[PDB]
Amino acid sequence: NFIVGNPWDDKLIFKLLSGLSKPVSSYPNTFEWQCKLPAIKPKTEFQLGSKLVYVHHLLGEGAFAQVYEATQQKFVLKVQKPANPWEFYIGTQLMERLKPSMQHMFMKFYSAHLFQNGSVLVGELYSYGTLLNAINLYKNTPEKVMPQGLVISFAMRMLYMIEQVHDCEIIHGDIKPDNFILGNGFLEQDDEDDLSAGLALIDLGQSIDMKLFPKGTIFTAKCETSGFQCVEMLSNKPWNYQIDYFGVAATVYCMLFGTYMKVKNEGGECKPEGLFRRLPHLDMWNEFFHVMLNIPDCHHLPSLDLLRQKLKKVFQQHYTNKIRALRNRLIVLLLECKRS
Ligand SMILES: Nc1ncnc2c1ncn2[C@@H]1O[C@H](COP(=O)(O)OP(=O)(O)O)[C@@H](O)[C@H]1O
Ligand SMILES: [Mg+2]
């Protein structure tokens, strides 16, 4: 039952990276440049060490990075100061541990460029915006919120995704609507029963590799670097994989209400704010959040498969017929937003 205070500490990360049989530098894709980070701005040109690259526009920004669209087929550039070789390590590892079939669920990194004061990562592109953006689009519409059938559908894919990541003994560490993105697969999704298509997960900067740590290690940090806090962090309790369970539930809560989840303690259990009576499938959602939020300990993680089945049951009873229309409607909204 080993203990590590902070898994996101820079000193710790440098120690793990430095203490590797296969340094990141060893990878073929990675490149180390002595010079400072090049000036990168939309509608400009610069050479990525060797070949010239054209940046068309800024797709999105986070607390750590700015992501631009680039060409010469289109891809993206993830720029951040200081350098973040860690993301490349995690991304590289993840594709290696994953089954080849499941790689399309996550962003692939083609190459990494490490500068003196920053890093630039070249990665796959997803052109139809984040899950958060999609949630915001509905607010303008009459429904004001995502249809349940799409919520449930997106939810089951998420549970399926973290299951694959956790099998790799990896923790995402930052599961939010901002870090979910919509790509072509969502557009071309033809098989509803296939959970591998229509949703992709990104932002591996805050990810944790459990392989590097002893068996049964635990973390006691009371918040994630951006300040993201799960239930264990609030309760001063230890945690490892629970943070991703909490993240999925927070992301699903957002699809349901279009507002970030807030937590409260009622009786002996932890519950989210405002699960009102008129909410469809209220029983199912109460059960879903109860399990995802109230985990007794690190050794009793809820079955991701079981949760998925409970949602699948409700989906098969009420939304198999209506799903195509709901997806088409969303597709039109995504196209409209992308036109802007
Ligand atoms: N592959 C991608 N395609 C399109 N946009 C992306 C891609 N990756 C990231 N983004 C955009 O970048 C923003 C944040 O990127 P992320 O990787 O989460 O960086 P950070 O760690 O700083 O949050 C997102 O809101 C998203 O719009
Ligand atoms: Mg992010």
Numbering used by the authors: 735 to 806, 816 to 1083
What sentences appear in the manuscript?
Bub1 and BubR1 are paralogous proteins at the core of the SAC. Contrarily to BubR1, Bub1 is a bona fide kinase, but its activity is believed to play a marginal role in the SAC. Bub1 phosphorylates Thr120 of histone H2A (P-T120-H2A), which in turn promotes centromere accumulation of Shugoshin and protein phosphatase 2A (PP2A), thus contributing to the establishment and protection of centromeric cohesion as well as to Aurora B kinase recruitment. Like other members of the eukaryotic protein kinase family, Bub1 consists of a small N-terminal lobe (N-lobe) rich in β-sheet structure, and a larger C-terminal lobe (C-lobe) rich in α-helices.
